[PDB]
Design a protein around this ligand. Structure first.
Ligand code: CU
Length: 91
């Protein structure tokens, strides 16, 4: 299945929403540019699941398929200092 994660929270915070999500191995994660762009996504240790290019427009989406079970930490480079970090748990 495909699950969506917003980049920039609906309440205006610099955060991914939901900040922690659990999925099944083989599922696809879609990040959607919501508010306070630009944003990007770097998945720690996983260059192949990362999207370093900045996303500027609202609605811009990009995705990654997580085939290996485990816990993955990811962050936004522009806003890492503001705590824009997330977690994906793959079951
Ligand atoms: Cu950001």
């Amino acid at each position: 299945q495909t699950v969506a994660i917003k980049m920039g929270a609906d309440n205006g915070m610099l955060a991914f929403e939901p900040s922690t999500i659990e999925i099944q191995a083989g599922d696809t994660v879609q990040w959607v540019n919501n508010k306070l762009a630009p944003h990007n996504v770097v998945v720690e240790g996983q260059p192949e699941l990362s999207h370093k290019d900045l996303a500027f427009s609202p609605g811009e989406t990009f995705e990654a398929t997580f085939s290996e079970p485990g816990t993955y930490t990811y962050y936004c480079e522009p806003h890492r200092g503001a705590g824009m970090v997330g977690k994906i748990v793959v079951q």
